[PDB]
């Protein structure tokens, strides 16, 4: 039970794994706060 | 160390050593040096006028 | 209401939010500075304005530190003098030996503040850094080996002139100021970077090599190119 | 030590504002996901993620890619250039297919990291700042990579190869050039940071939920 | 060289007060024009203003 | 009283070494995500009190009371969002503990983020992870997705009515961006140059909003302290140095590793027990860096009896730092090792301050001349003085941390520098 390395899921990640996961997570997020302007240059 | 007549020197290449920095004009006790400068055709900082009044110079 | 602070033991009544540098100015003491301009934002990166507070073990940046109630500012203390000497040592350690060929000449803040607040000798026994010269148009001449990375031109460009074409590229000792591309900084307010640059990194190109500051006589007139009457 | 890479841009036929670069539709979806991680009015916070995405798509960062990121995020191109030149994970120059990065800081230097570097240089026949003639491998030195206990180690395209010996790194390079992808991790029989001799801690099974919980909590 | 015929070309006098300068000019009989001293006005400087949440004072670079 | 011999039942970071499942099922098999709703219902003041009683100090460098920090954060709102920023830019040369925590205990990290955000009244937590830790960041994102799906974070987190978001932002290469204000500047898409204090991050942080920056280890041990006591945590360790610690023993040691131990375990015991001792035995020890590159070194004389502890190491003219123990045996070039450290700091200096920028480059050149002996004995005091000029005069603490290794080398190995200078002079004197 304490002899095998179980962190083997990471020998499959590709370049876009992190960003694809970020895309998948977008629906669970909450609305972002707004500073009232579109940009500090506005 | 003797101080006689003045001269403007050159580098071994023949280029003038003076870069028109006007330190001599500033330090001259007798106000005997007059200097005017401008960028040369190759962009060098060089003098166009360098006068010494040897009747005003205190050597 | 106004709070009370002390500069070298003398009482000053200053509004909250006033900085150490401004309080010393109020009592008449001008703290040395390179990156601080009162018309621009506060950077606090040259570390030339470090002063000692009475009980603080650490020096503070006078240009960016608001005064607290009952602070004693030791403007001529041993800690402040040594801090200024160290900062000036670093600046002159990497600066180039270009004073005779530099238009900043007798009107240079590095020279004047080195004669006033720095040491008279050099401990730097290494090689210096040489920086490639950028080109930003026909008005401003850039000799960027003399830059002290005070970022006044960046702040001025951005905030005052509304042009964000200047910045710092890279990091470390090899950090450079410029555009990163061959772009000309052309604006109706472009010579003011010549004015605010404390060193000879930015110099006037029409005025190049023509005169020295002590020679010139100053006549106070007004401008007639427009109806502002500058 | 001089870096050797200049922080000014000179227009070239392969690298100029007219160089074709634009994000794929999938990458635009990813950009849209990234941008809405930050408050409204602070869209400029996405400069690092979007620039990294552009480099991930294009292999490196041309000036056209930088200008495209600036255009998408409505941020000054000089601000994008500042970020790109500041951060060392961005490739502003074309790089090899495999970017070998040998860590040479003191914890990795105490173990024979110079042997690893020399083995790589002899195996590939390149210096420590050059690319192979077939544009397949690039070799550089880097600072601490966070695997100090697994020293010496290299990173090859965001994979850590750890506890290396010259033979191990030569085998890794051989697998890379043949076509296979070597498994990341230690090559010395370890699985992770645990001591090689044997587990000196965490030998018994972990305690269950609510083991030593407080009274009220 | 640059010539002159004006004796008072390089003459500059230093006074501690406007009243002293005016009295000197009046007793020596010259005409005079007085310019009121210009001092910079106090300014509100805030480092924290560089990082405003909703105001335009937020700087794009350091 | 003696310290050490921590028990596996009392080690906080189980699943270290990755021998168990790191997913939600495995994490919940251990104590993670247990009565988190009850903790949140207890609320901010109770969590702050528990942390203050536990006496936890900052685990990512400067050891500052985390209860006091989060109390600074606990002021009433004023119409701005509130953020917890979890620092995971583990750039310190010798430190891998944050990597292990992210890679094998991501749900512990996420639960700690939720607990700290509730304590500080924060709507969101940005986890700033360094860009080389790509696989670690991906594992973290997988754990966060599992938590969102299980309802542990997000809207009505843990069924408590508290909305809390967890984002993961990947940096690029910048040991300086590891710094708190540089971390904030990096998140905002800027260069990543430290700010001046004031304003403090609790007043103007990321996006100009109140933020608290906390280390991965600190936030990860937070929920275990809340669920357990904190009288327990204070029981582990000395009086003002309480709890457990992750030590990364590396360098000239037989079995380099990452271990968890008590806060006041003696250095010699730790090395001899968890790492197999120095390579040639304890007699072969030359020097130890006990807190990563920033902290000075100590000779074998100090290492003979010294406690791997904040105050204990400060009294030895050092610091605990990140508890990254780099061991150098007698068959090493100590001058060259310190020169490589100074070169590291030269490459990682952000260049904002004249002191750090110019002086760190200057010290790099002087050390490079020292390692070959191409110097004079009168340049040792000059180097000491310029390092003293850098320290305390810089915007951030990288300037201070670039001077302490130089000071430690000068303090404990000046005869070696002088002997090397003498040998070089003799080599040149021959011709
Ligand atoms: C991974 C990491 C890297 C750090 N790097 C630096 C650094 O380069 N320079 C510095 O002055 N402080 C550095 N620090 C310390 C931070 O300024 C700050 O103490 C820490 O991020 C949060 O404090 P705390 O966790 O002790 O509460 C680092 C901290 C962490 C966690
Ligand atoms: S201006 Fe005078 S001091 Fe300067 S270089 Fe020429 S001769 Fe020498
Ligand atoms: S900028 Fe000032 S100190 Fe530097 S070379 Fe020019 S005059 Fe001399
Ligand atoms: S060019 Fe001049 S104004 Fe700009 S950062 Fe350099 S010294 Fe300052
Ligand atoms: S001390 Fe160095 S790393 Fe820190 S802000 Fe100043 S220049 Fe940057
Ligand atoms: S004038 Fe204050 S740090 Fe520059
Ligand atoms: S010193 Fe090489 S990974 Fe840290
Ligand atoms: Mg100028």
Automatic annotation (TrEMBL), chain A:
> Would you say which domain of life the source belongs to?
Eukaryota
Give the protein name, as stated in the record.
NADH:ubiquinone oxidoreductase subunit V3
Q: What organism does the UniProt record list as the source?
A: Sus scrofa
UniProtKB/TrEMBL annotation, chain B:
Disulfide feature: 24-28
Where is the 4Fe-4S ferredoxin-type domain positioned along the sequence?
9-38
Annotated [4Fe-4S] cluster 1 binding lies at 18, 21, 24
Where can this protein be found?
Mitochondrion inner membrane
User: Which amino acids does the record list as binding [4Fe-4S] cluster 2?
Assistant: 28, 57
Name it.
NADH dehydrogenase [ubiquinone] iron-sulfur protein 8, mitochondrial
Entry function: Core subunit of the mitochondrial membrane respiratory chain NADH dehydrogenase (Complex I) which catalyzes electron transfer from NADH through the respiratory chain, using ubiquinone as an electron acceptor. Essential for the catalytic activity and assembly of complex I.
Entry similarity comment = Belongs to the complex I 23 kDa subunit family.
Q: Which domain of life is it from?
A: Eukaryota
UniProtKB/TrEMBL annotation, chain C:
Per UniProt, [4Fe-4S] cluster 1 binds at: 95
Provide the residue positions that the database annotates as binding [4Fe-4S] cluster 4: 148
Q: Name one GO biological process term.
A: mitochondrial respiratory chain complex I assembly
Residues where Mg(2+) 8 binds: 194, 202
Q: Show the coiled coil region(s).
A: none
- Indicate which residues the UniProt annotation says bind Mg(2+) 12: 202
Gene Ontology CC: mitochondrial inner membrane; respiratory chain complex I
Q: Which residues bind Mg(2+) 6?
A: 194, 197
Q: Which residues bind [2Fe-2S] cluster 3?
A: 35, 46, 63
The residues that hold Mg(2+) 2 are 104, 194, 197
Q: Which residues bind Mg(2+) 10?
A: 199
Per UniProt, Mg(2+) 7 binds at 194, 197, 199, 202
- Gene Ontology MF annotations: 2 iron, 2 sulfur cluster binding; 4 iron, 4 sulfur cluster binding; metal ion binding; NADH dehydrogenase (ubiquinone) activity; oxidoreductase activity, acting on NAD(P)H
Q: Which UniProt keywords apply?
A: 2Fe-2S, 4Fe-4S, Acetylation, Electron transport, Iron, Iron-sulfur, Membrane, Metal-binding, Mitochondrion, Mitochondrion inner membrane, NAD, Oxidoreductase, Respiratory chain, Transit peptide, Translocase, Transport, Ubiquinone
Q: Where does [4Fe-4S] cluster 3 bind?
A: 147, 150, 153, 197
Amino-acid positions noted as binding Mg(2+) 11 in the UniProt annotation, renumbered to this chain: 199, 202
Q: List positions binding Mg(2+) 3.
A: 104, 199
Q: Which positions does UniProt annotate for Mg(2+) 5 binding?
A: 194
**According to the lineage, what is the superkingdom?**
Eukaryota
Q: What is its main location?
A: mitochondrion
Residues where Mg(2+) 9 binds: 197, 199
Main function: Core subunit of the mitochondrial membrane respiratory chain NADH dehydrogenase (Complex I) which catalyzes electron transfer from NADH through the respiratory chain, using ubiquinone as an electron acceptor. Essential for catalysing the entry and efficient transfer of electrons within complex I. Plays a key role in the assembly and stability of complex I and participates in the association of complex I with ubiquinol-cytochrome reductase complex (Complex III) to form supercomplexes.
UniProt lists the family membership as follows: Belongs to the complex I 75 kDa subunit family.
Name under which the protein is recorded: NADH-ubiquinone oxidoreductase 75 kDa subunit, mitochondrial
User: Gene for this protein?
Assistant: NDUFS1
TrEMBL record, chain F:
Q: Where does [4Fe-4S] cluster 4 bind?
A: 356
Binding positions for [4Fe-4S] cluster 3 per the UniProt entry? 350, 353, 356, 396
Report residues binding NADH 2. Answer: 60-61, 64, 69, 91-92, 180
| Record carries keyword GTP-binding | no
Known catalysed reaction(s)? a ubiquinone + NADH + 5 H(+)(in) = a ubiquinol + NAD(+) + 4 H(+)(out)
For this protein, the record's Pfam families field holds:
Complex1_51K, NADH_4Fe-4S, SLBB_2
Coarse class of the primary localization is mitochondrion
Which cofactor(s) are needed, names only?
A: [4Fe-4S] cluster; FMN
The reply to whether Transport figures as a keyword in the UniProt entry is: yes
Q: Which residues bind FMN 8?
A: 60, 90-91, 180, 215, 218
Give the record's family classification: Belongs to the complex I 51 kDa subunit family.
What this protein is called in its record is: NADH dehydrogenase [ubiquinone] flavoprotein 1, mitochondrial
Q: Source taxonomy lineage?
A: Eukaryota, Metazoa, Chordata, Craniata, Vertebrata
